[PDB]
């Protein structure tokens, strides 16, 4: 509010840990939870623009969780925790929700995984309609094709 | 009767809140509640739509119960 130090600081750190992104990514294989905590701090800031810039770092990292066929259970939990907390206003998470769906398509993940993750995405965006709507109809359309079979 | 509603909206706990109302201004409250429903993209009148509308265009007078200590 009366201080502008948080705006400056989130940009500095996002820069630093986007050049430490390869170091983090290698640690991610050793402990994905250790790697993830570096980035979480950035999004606990109050600057929605610099939270958006650093949500890009997360989306990149969570390819590894997605690719695996047991780590995406924690991805579903993270989405739920981030949206409820503050939303990092409501801009940052819109781009996050969007970018998980594209990943599921290129990975070729099983019908069962595709179902449950997308089921968690629609449970959460249910009462929301701040811009989730746009994504939300395509997201359900993915379930539909599976449910025809 | 004219409009649709959800059964969460009350009509009858709105009689006491303002007494100096004309009927055209009760036609105003309800017509504005169908505007507020449309900013949601809802086609049934909620009590969020109806009480938000009720509060405005009903101004504040020297007769109303908004200021009351005369009881």
């Amino acid at each position: 509010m009366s201080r502008d130090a948080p705006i400056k600081a989130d940009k500095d750190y996002s820069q630093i840990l986007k050049e430490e992104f390869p170091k983090i990514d290698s640690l991610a294989q050793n402990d994905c939870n250790s790697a993830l905590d570096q980035l979480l701090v950035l999004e606990k800031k109050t600057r929605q623009a610099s939270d958006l810039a650093s949500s890009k770092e997360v989306l990149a990292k969570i390819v590894d969780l997605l690719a695996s066929r047991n780590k995406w259970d924690d991805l579903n939990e993270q989405l739920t925790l981030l949206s409820k907390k503050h939303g990092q206003l409501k801009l940052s998470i819109q781009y996050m929700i969007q970018k998980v769906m594209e990943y599921l398509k290129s990975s070729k993940s099983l019908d069962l995984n595709t179902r449950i993750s997308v089921i968690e995405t629609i449970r959460v965006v249910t009462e929301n309609k701040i811009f989730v709507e746009v994504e939300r109809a395509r997201v359900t359309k993915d379930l539909v094709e599976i449910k025809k079979e | 009767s004219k409009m649709s509603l959800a059964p969460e909206a009350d009509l009858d706990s709105l009689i006491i809140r303002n007494d100096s109302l004309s009927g055209a201004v009760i036609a105003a409250i309800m017509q504005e509640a169908g505007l507020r429903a449309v900013r949601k993209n809802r086609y049934v009148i909620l009590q969020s739509d109806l009480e938000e509308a009720y509060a405005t265009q009903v101004k504040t007078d020297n007769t109303v119960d908004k200021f009351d200590f005369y009881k």
Binding site: - | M3, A37, R39, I45
Partner: protein
């Protein structure tokens, strides 16, 4: 004196509020059939001069592209009582 959809800055919140009454029943009166209310008619604009109450009118004439009129202030006031009624 026509201008873009967003041609008064900051009073953008008032443009959105204006189109609820005007443009949403204009294209489809039918979404209000479900609702069941009297069709939204009538708008009053008031402010301290210089905020583009009229500049907005030129924007909502241009953007919608519907038939537009417009009235001079006092040039639709005649010298005959009830002839100035007939015109309007």
């Amino acid at each position: 004196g026509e201008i873009t959809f967003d041609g008064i800055g900051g009073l953008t919140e008032q443009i959105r509020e204006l189109r609820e009454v005007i443009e949403l029943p204009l294209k489809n009166p039918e979404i209000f059939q479900r609702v069941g209310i009297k069709p939204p008619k009538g708008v009053l604009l008031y402010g301290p001069p210089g905020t583009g109450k009229t500049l907005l009118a030129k924007a909502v004439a241009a953007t919608i592209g519907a038939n537009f009129i417009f009235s001079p202030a006092s040039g639709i006031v005649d010298k005959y009582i009830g002839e100035s009624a007939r015109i309007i």
